[PDB]
Design a protein around this ligand. Structure first.
Ligand SMILES: O=C(NCCOc1ccccc1)c1nc([C@@H]2CCCN2C(=O)CCc2ccccc2Cl)[nH]c(=O)c1O
Ligand SMILES: [Mn+2]
Ligand SMILES: [Mn+2]
Length: 180
């Protein structure tokens, strides 16, 4: 209890994000007060997922991440039963109504090549689309199709680096980079 990282997360991310991540961790039997680096990780993933869906047009994206597990799979079933898209083996983060594909968004502190490969071999779902951002500003997506416009992904990268600096300025970055 009482880590600097936990107090930083609550001050760095907005309350709706923090509570959704708290719900997510407790749902999977994990404590945000002890596994604080993870706590930071899902908050980052949540905010990136929400900025991503803000980049399309009005009705482009269905948001799967941030739901409770039962309701997330319910919406996936309805998406599949109306688009004819194969049911993904694991929960994705969004659905693209424009390009008719599920999106799995990744945020990694290692180089982009390694995370994508793990995300692809562990997906094995041939149809889903994969998009990785890093805390240094690199990105890679399936078939080099990055879905969104340059400006929308750019502000995602800007926000990721700002998170890194605020962590580093509190001597918390070294611990977070070695957690993954
Ligand atoms: O959806 C995902 N996991 C289902 C929920 O798992 C939970 C597990 C515990 C509590 C609460 C939830 C998911 N997992 C992952 C990663 C790599 C595979 C395992 N992993 C996790 O252990 C989630 C922790 C994490 C790390 C980095 C960024 C974001 C996150 Cl969340 N990376 C995603 O991008 C993603 O979307
Ligand atoms: Mn997810
Ligand atoms: Mn994801």
């Amino acid at each position: 209890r009482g880590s600097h990282m936990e107090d930083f997360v609550r001050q760095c991310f907005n309350p709706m994000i923090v509570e959704l991540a708290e719900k997510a961790m407790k749902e999977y039997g994990e404590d945000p007060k002890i596994e604080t680096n993870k706590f930071a990780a899902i908050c980052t993933h949540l905010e990136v997922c929400f900025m991503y869906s803000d980049g399309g047009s009005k009705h482009r994206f269905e948001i799967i991440e941030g739901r409770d597990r039962i309701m997330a799979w319910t919406v996936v079933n309805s998406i599949c039963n109306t688009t004819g898209v194969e049911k993904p083996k694991f929960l994705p983060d969004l659905y693209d109504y424009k390009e008719n594909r599920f999106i799995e968004i990744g945020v990694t502190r290692r180089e982009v090549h390694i995370y994508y490969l793990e995300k692809a071999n562990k997906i094995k779902s041939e149809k889903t689309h994969i998009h990785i951002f890093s805390f240094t500003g690199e990105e890679m997506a399936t078939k080099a199709d990055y879905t969104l416009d340059e400006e929308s992904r750019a502000r995602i990268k800007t926000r990721l680096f700002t998170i890194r600096q605020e962590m580093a300025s509190r001597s918390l970055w070294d611990s977070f980079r070695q957690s993954e």
